[PDB]
Design an enzyme around this catalytic site. Structure first.
Site, PDB file in Angstrom:
ATOM      1  N   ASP A 104     122.661  11.421   4.669  1.00  0.00           N
ATOM      2  CA  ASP A 104     122.193  10.251   3.930  1.00  0.00           C
ATOM      3  C   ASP A 104     123.382   9.407   3.485  1.00  0.00           C
ATOM      4  OD1 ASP A 104     120.846   8.433   2.413  1.00  0.00           O
ATOM      5  OD2 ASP A 104     120.370   9.852   0.774  1.00  0.00           O
ATOM      6  N   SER A 118     125.283  -9.014   6.621  1.00  0.00           N
ATOM      7  CA  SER A 118     124.875  -9.500   7.926  1.00  0.00           C
ATOM      8  C   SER A 118     124.960 -11.022   7.965  1.00  0.00           C
ATOM      9  CB  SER A 118     123.442  -9.043   8.212  1.00  0.00           C
ATOM     10  OG  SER A 118     122.939  -9.591   9.412  1.00  0.00           O
TER      11      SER A 118
END
EC number: 3.4.23.22
Length: 330
Positions: free
Chosen positions: A35, A199
Protein backbone atom coordinates in the site's frame (compact mmCIF):
# COMPACT_ATOMS: atom_id res chain seq x y z
CA UNK A 1 20.82 -5.68 -2.78
CA UNK A 2 17.57 -6.10 -4.68
CA UNK A 3 14.26 -7.89 -4.30
CA UNK A 4 11.58 -9.04 -6.73
CA UNK A 5 8.18 -10.47 -5.82
CA UNK A 6 5.07 -11.38 -7.79
CA UNK A 7 1.84 -9.64 -6.81
CA UNK A 8 -1.45 -11.41 -7.55
CA UNK A 9 -5.04 -10.10 -7.76
CA UNK A 10 -7.22 -11.33 -4.91
CA UNK A 11 -10.26 -11.83 -7.16
CA UNK A 12 -11.51 -11.59 -10.74
CA UNK A 13 -12.02 -7.81 -10.49
CA UNK A 14 -8.52 -6.86 -9.32
CA UNK A 15 -10.05 -5.45 -6.12
CA UNK A 16 -6.59 -5.64 -4.51
CA UNK A 17 -3.26 -7.41 -4.97
CA UNK A 18 -1.41 -9.67 -2.50
CA UNK A 19 2.33 -10.28 -2.36
CA UNK A 20 3.99 -13.01 -0.27
CA UNK A 21 6.18 -11.74 2.57
CA UNK A 22 8.44 -13.84 4.81
CA UNK A 23 8.32 -12.85 8.49
CA UNK A 24 10.41 -14.33 11.28
CA UNK A 25 12.63 -17.35 11.78
CA UNK A 26 11.74 -19.90 10.54
CA UNK A 27 9.87 -17.91 7.93
CA UNK A 28 6.13 -17.43 8.26
CA UNK A 29 4.80 -16.45 4.84
CA UNK A 30 1.87 -14.04 4.86
CA UNK A 31 0.16 -12.51 1.82
CA UNK A 32 0.18 -8.75 2.31
CA UNK A 33 -1.44 -5.85 0.46
CA UNK A 34 1.38 -3.51 -0.54
CA UNK A 35 0.00 0.00 0.00
CA UNK A 36 1.80 3.10 -1.26
CA UNK A 37 -0.88 5.15 0.53
CA UNK A 38 0.00 4.12 4.10
CA UNK A 39 3.08 3.47 6.19
CA UNK A 40 2.33 0.60 8.61
CA UNK A 41 3.31 -3.04 8.14
CA UNK A 42 0.61 -4.83 10.12
CA UNK A 43 -0.49 -8.45 10.18
CA UNK A 44 -3.17 -10.76 11.44
CA UNK A 45 -1.58 -12.58 14.34
CA UNK A 46 -1.91 -15.03 17.21
CA UNK A 47 -2.98 -11.92 19.19
CA UNK A 48 -5.91 -10.99 16.94
CA UNK A 49 -9.31 -11.38 18.60
CA UNK A 50 -10.38 -14.87 17.55
CA UNK A 51 -13.85 -13.83 16.33
CA UNK A 52 -12.17 -11.31 13.99
CA UNK A 53 -10.06 -13.95 12.19
CA UNK A 54 -11.83 -15.81 9.34
CA UNK A 55 -9.38 -17.71 7.14
CA UNK A 56 -6.35 -15.42 7.19
CA UNK A 57 -2.87 -16.73 7.82
CA UNK A 58 -1.56 -15.39 11.11
CA UNK A 59 1.85 -14.35 12.35
CA UNK A 60 2.76 -16.04 15.65
CA UNK A 61 5.70 -14.13 17.15
CA UNK A 62 6.28 -16.75 19.86
CA UNK A 63 7.23 -19.23 17.10
CA UNK A 64 9.87 -16.87 15.66
CA UNK A 65 13.31 -17.00 17.23
CA UNK A 66 14.09 -13.50 15.94
CA UNK A 67 10.91 -11.78 17.17
CA UNK A 68 11.25 -9.23 19.97
CA UNK A 69 8.41 -7.29 21.58
CA UNK A 70 8.88 -3.56 21.04
CA UNK A 71 8.08 -2.70 24.63
CA UNK A 72 5.37 -0.09 25.16
CA UNK A 73 4.66 0.42 21.46
CA UNK A 74 1.10 0.43 20.16
CA UNK A 75 -0.47 1.27 16.82
CA UNK A 76 -3.89 2.23 15.54
CA UNK A 77 -4.84 3.11 11.98
CA UNK A 78 -7.98 4.23 10.18
CA UNK A 79 -8.04 4.07 6.40
CA UNK A 80 -9.85 6.28 3.91
CA UNK A 81 -12.47 3.58 3.33
CA UNK A 82 -13.55 3.57 6.99
CA UNK A 83 -11.72 0.37 7.95
CA UNK A 84 -9.29 0.17 10.85
CA UNK A 85 -6.97 -2.00 12.91
CA UNK A 86 -4.80 -1.70 16.01
CA UNK A 87 -2.46 -3.64 18.26
CA UNK A 88 1.08 -3.95 19.61
CA UNK A 89 4.47 -4.20 17.88
CA UNK A 90 7.31 -6.67 17.44
CA UNK A 91 10.55 -6.32 15.59
CA UNK A 92 11.51 -9.24 13.36
CA UNK A 93 13.23 -10.18 10.12
CA UNK A 94 11.09 -9.46 7.05
CA UNK A 95 11.97 -10.55 3.52
CA UNK A 96 10.24 -9.62 0.25
CA UNK A 97 11.31 -11.31 -2.95
CA UNK A 98 14.77 -12.11 -1.60
CA UNK A 99 15.40 -8.70 0.01
CA UNK A 100 15.82 -8.99 3.79
CA UNK A 101 15.41 -6.33 6.49
CA UNK A 102 16.34 -7.14 10.07
CA UNK A 103 14.63 -5.30 12.91
CA UNK A 104 11.54 -4.37 10.91
CA UNK A 105 8.58 -3.22 12.98
CA UNK A 106 5.82 -5.81 12.48
CA UNK A 107 2.60 -4.42 13.89
CA UNK A 108 0.55 -7.27 15.34
CA UNK A 109 -3.21 -6.77 15.18
CA UNK A 110 -5.23 -7.22 18.34
CA UNK A 111 -8.34 -5.78 16.65
CA UNK A 112 -9.37 -5.44 13.00
CA UNK A 113 -12.56 -4.03 11.56
CA UNK A 114 -15.16 -6.10 9.75
CA UNK A 115 -13.94 -5.47 6.20
CA UNK A 116 -10.58 -7.03 7.07
CA UNK A 117 -12.13 -10.05 8.79
CA UNK A 118 -14.40 -10.57 5.80
CA UNK A 119 -11.50 -10.67 3.33
CA UNK A 120 -9.79 -14.00 3.91
CA UNK A 121 -7.20 -13.39 1.17
CA UNK A 122 -5.40 -10.43 2.78
CA UNK A 123 -3.23 -11.28 5.80
CA UNK A 124 -2.20 -7.66 6.46
CA UNK A 125 -0.76 -4.55 4.84
CA UNK A 126 2.77 -3.47 3.97
CA UNK A 127 2.86 0.31 3.81
CA UNK A 128 5.10 2.04 1.26
CA UNK A 129 4.21 5.72 1.78
CA UNK A 130 6.55 7.96 3.74
CA UNK A 131 7.48 6.95 7.29
CA UNK A 132 6.06 10.22 8.67
CA UNK A 133 2.61 8.58 8.41
CA UNK A 134 3.53 5.52 10.51
CA UNK A 135 1.15 5.22 13.45
CA UNK A 136 3.36 3.49 16.04
CA UNK A 137 3.43 5.34 19.37
CA UNK A 138 5.36 6.57 21.26
CA UNK A 139 8.25 5.90 18.83
CA UNK A 140 7.30 6.13 15.17
CA UNK A 141 8.69 3.28 13.07
CA UNK A 142 10.14 3.09 9.58
CA UNK A 143 8.62 1.35 6.57
CA UNK A 144 10.18 -1.72 5.00
CA UNK A 145 11.39 0.43 2.08
CA UNK A 146 12.89 3.03 4.41
CA UNK A 147 14.76 0.30 6.32
CA UNK A 148 15.98 -1.36 3.12
CA UNK A 149 16.87 1.80 1.22
CA UNK A 150 20.53 2.15 2.16
CA UNK A 151 21.27 -1.48 1.23
CA UNK A 152 19.50 -1.30 -2.13
CA UNK A 153 21.47 -0.93 -5.35
CA UNK A 154 19.30 2.12 -6.13
CA UNK A 155 16.83 3.74 -3.65
CA UNK A 156 13.75 2.83 -5.66
CA UNK A 157 10.91 0.39 -5.88
CA UNK A 158 8.64 -0.25 -8.85
CA UNK A 159 5.01 -1.32 -9.20
CA UNK A 160 3.97 -3.28 -12.30
CA UNK A 161 0.39 -4.32 -11.55
CA UNK A 162 -1.40 -6.66 -13.91
CA UNK A 163 -4.86 -6.36 -15.45
CA UNK A 164 -6.65 -9.57 -14.47
CA UNK A 165 -3.19 -11.10 -14.12
CA UNK A 166 -0.20 -11.19 -11.77
CA UNK A 167 2.41 -8.47 -11.79
CA UNK A 168 5.61 -7.53 -9.97
CA UNK A 169 7.01 -5.35 -7.19
CA UNK A 170 10.77 -4.80 -7.55
CA UNK A 171 13.07 -3.19 -5.00
CA UNK A 172 16.41 -1.60 -5.77
CA UNK A 173 16.44 -1.76 -9.58
CA UNK A 174 14.45 -0.74 -12.65
CA UNK A 175 13.69 -3.66 -15.01
CA UNK A 176 14.18 -2.04 -18.41
CA UNK A 177 12.46 -5.01 -20.11
CA UNK A 178 9.19 -4.38 -18.21
CA UNK A 179 7.99 -1.26 -20.07
CA UNK A 180 7.86 0.28 -23.54
CA UNK A 181 9.28 3.62 -24.59
CA UNK A 182 10.75 5.87 -21.91
CA UNK A 183 9.91 6.53 -18.26
CA UNK A 184 8.71 10.08 -17.63
CA UNK A 185 9.58 11.38 -14.17
CA UNK A 186 7.54 13.96 -12.29
CA UNK A 187 7.99 15.84 -9.04
CA UNK A 188 6.66 14.54 -5.72
CA UNK A 189 5.51 16.46 -2.66
CA UNK A 190 5.96 14.61 0.63
CA UNK A 191 4.21 17.30 2.70
CA UNK A 192 1.22 15.02 3.38
CA UNK A 193 3.28 11.83 3.67
CA UNK A 194 2.08 10.48 0.30
CA UNK A 195 3.55 9.98 -3.15
CA UNK A 196 1.77 13.16 -4.21
CA UNK A 197 2.24 14.48 -7.74
CA UNK A 198 0.47 16.63 -10.34
CA UNK A 199 -0.95 15.15 -13.53
CA UNK A 200 -0.93 17.49 -16.52
CA UNK A 201 -4.42 16.64 -17.74
CA UNK A 202 -6.71 14.05 -19.25
CA UNK A 203 -8.60 12.82 -22.30
CA UNK A 204 -11.75 10.71 -22.63
CA UNK A 205 -11.59 8.09 -25.35
CA UNK A 206 -10.42 9.56 -28.65
CA UNK A 207 -11.26 13.09 -27.47
CA UNK A 208 -8.92 16.04 -27.27
CA UNK A 209 -6.52 16.26 -24.35
CA UNK A 210 -7.48 18.82 -21.71
CA UNK A 211 -4.42 20.46 -20.17
CA UNK A 212 -5.14 20.98 -16.49
CA UNK A 213 -3.23 20.33 -13.27
CA UNK A 214 -4.65 17.48 -11.17
CA UNK A 215 -2.89 16.97 -7.83
CA UNK A 216 -3.23 13.44 -6.48
CA UNK A 217 -1.49 10.47 -4.90
CA UNK A 218 -0.15 7.26 -6.40
CA UNK A 219 -1.84 4.67 -4.16
CA UNK A 220 -1.49 0.93 -4.81
CA UNK A 221 -3.81 0.24 -1.85
CA UNK A 222 -6.82 1.93 -3.44
CA UNK A 223 -8.70 -0.03 -6.10
CA UNK A 224 -10.23 2.74 -8.18
CA UNK A 225 -9.32 6.07 -9.80
CA UNK A 226 -10.78 9.04 -7.86
CA UNK A 227 -10.71 12.38 -9.68
CA UNK A 228 -12.48 15.76 -9.54
CA UNK A 229 -16.20 15.71 -10.24
CA UNK A 230 -15.78 17.75 -13.44
CA UNK A 231 -13.39 15.16 -14.90
CA UNK A 232 -15.50 12.18 -13.81
CA UNK A 233 -18.69 13.73 -15.22
CA UNK A 234 -16.93 14.29 -18.56
CA UNK A 235 -15.89 10.63 -18.67
CA UNK A 236 -19.27 9.08 -17.81
CA UNK A 237 -21.12 11.45 -20.15
CA UNK A 238 -19.57 9.39 -22.96
CA UNK A 239 -21.25 6.18 -21.73
CA UNK A 240 -24.92 5.92 -22.66
CA UNK A 241 -27.05 5.26 -19.61
CA UNK A 242 -24.32 5.97 -17.06
CA UNK A 243 -25.40 7.85 -13.95
CA UNK A 244 -24.25 8.65 -10.45
CA UNK A 245 -26.29 6.64 -7.96
CA UNK A 246 -26.47 7.91 -4.40
CA UNK A 247 -27.86 4.56 -3.23
CA UNK A 248 -25.05 2.54 -4.80
CA UNK A 249 -22.36 5.07 -3.92
CA UNK A 250 -21.00 6.22 -7.25
CA UNK A 251 -21.27 6.05 -11.00
CA UNK A 252 -22.88 2.96 -12.48
CA UNK A 253 -23.39 2.08 -16.12
CA UNK A 254 -25.27 -0.52 -18.17
CA UNK A 255 -23.31 -3.76 -18.28
CA UNK A 256 -24.07 -3.87 -22.03
CA UNK A 257 -21.97 -0.73 -22.62
CA UNK A 258 -18.51 -0.54 -24.15
CA UNK A 259 -16.39 1.82 -22.08
CA UNK A 260 -14.06 4.42 -23.58
CA UNK A 261 -10.46 4.67 -22.53
CA UNK A 262 -9.21 7.35 -20.14
CA UNK A 263 -5.84 9.06 -20.65
CA UNK A 264 -3.93 10.93 -17.97
CA UNK A 265 -0.90 13.16 -18.46
CA UNK A 266 2.51 12.72 -16.86
CA UNK A 267 4.45 15.76 -17.96
CA UNK A 268 4.33 15.69 -21.76
CA UNK A 269 3.71 11.92 -21.72
CA UNK A 270 0.36 10.13 -21.71
CA UNK A 271 -0.81 6.96 -19.98
CA UNK A 272 -3.86 5.29 -21.54
CA UNK A 273 -6.24 3.30 -19.33
CA UNK A 274 -8.21 0.92 -21.60
CA UNK A 275 -11.96 1.03 -21.15
CA UNK A 276 -12.07 -2.57 -19.96
CA UNK A 277 -9.95 -1.59 -16.92
CA UNK A 278 -12.79 0.74 -15.81
CA UNK A 279 -15.42 -2.07 -15.63
CA UNK A 280 -15.90 -3.39 -12.08
CA UNK A 281 -18.82 -5.60 -12.98
CA UNK A 282 -22.34 -6.03 -11.66
CA UNK A 283 -23.21 -4.08 -8.52
CA UNK A 284 -24.75 -7.29 -7.14
CA UNK A 285 -24.81 -10.81 -8.55
CA UNK A 286 -27.01 -10.99 -11.62
CA UNK A 287 -27.52 -7.23 -11.93
CA UNK A 288 -27.26 -5.52 -15.30
CA UNK A 289 -25.96 -2.35 -13.60
CA UNK A 290 -22.17 -2.31 -13.43
CA UNK A 291 -19.90 -0.31 -11.13
CA UNK A 292 -17.51 2.23 -12.63
CA UNK A 293 -13.78 2.29 -12.00
CA UNK A 294 -13.50 6.09 -12.25
CA UNK A 295 -15.30 7.84 -9.39
CA UNK A 296 -15.48 11.33 -7.93
CA UNK A 297 -12.99 12.39 -5.26
CA UNK A 298 -15.26 15.22 -4.12
CA UNK A 299 -16.00 13.50 -0.80
CA UNK A 300 -12.43 12.36 -0.07
CA UNK A 301 -10.37 15.55 0.07
CA UNK A 302 -7.69 14.27 -2.32
CA UNK A 303 -7.51 12.78 -5.79
CA UNK A 304 -6.27 9.18 -5.86
CA UNK A 305 -4.50 7.40 -8.72
CA UNK A 306 -5.37 3.94 -7.50
CA UNK A 307 -4.92 0.55 -9.13
CA UNK A 308 -7.17 1.35 -12.13
CA UNK A 309 -4.64 3.99 -13.17
CA UNK A 310 -1.43 2.40 -11.90
CA UNK A 311 -2.01 -0.97 -13.58
CA UNK A 312 -1.92 0.79 -16.97
CA UNK A 313 1.68 1.82 -16.30
CA UNK A 314 5.08 0.75 -15.06
CA UNK A 315 5.52 3.01 -12.04
CA UNK A 316 8.82 3.98 -10.40
CA UNK A 317 8.74 5.16 -6.78
CA UNK A 318 12.10 6.96 -6.55
CA UNK A 319 13.07 7.38 -2.90
CA UNK A 320 16.17 9.47 -3.52
CA UNK A 321 16.79 12.45 -1.23
CA UNK A 322 14.36 14.39 -3.41
CA UNK A 323 11.73 11.78 -4.29
CA UNK A 324 10.16 11.56 -7.74
CA UNK A 325 7.64 9.34 -9.53
CA UNK A 326 8.18 7.79 -12.94
CA UNK A 327 5.54 6.45 -15.34
CA UNK A 328 6.01 4.39 -18.51
CA UNK A 329 3.58 2.64 -20.80
CA UNK A 330 3.90 -1.13 -21.01
Amino acid sequence: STGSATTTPIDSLDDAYITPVQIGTPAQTLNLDFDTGSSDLWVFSSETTASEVDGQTIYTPSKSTTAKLLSGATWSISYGDGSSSSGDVYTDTVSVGGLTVTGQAVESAKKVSSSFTEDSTIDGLLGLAFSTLNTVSPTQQKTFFDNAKASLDSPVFTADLGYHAPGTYNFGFIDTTAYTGSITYTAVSTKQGFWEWTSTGYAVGSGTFKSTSIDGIADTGTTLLYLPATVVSAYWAQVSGAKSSSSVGGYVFPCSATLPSFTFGVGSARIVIPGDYIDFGPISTGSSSCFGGIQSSAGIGINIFGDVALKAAFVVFNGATTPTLGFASK
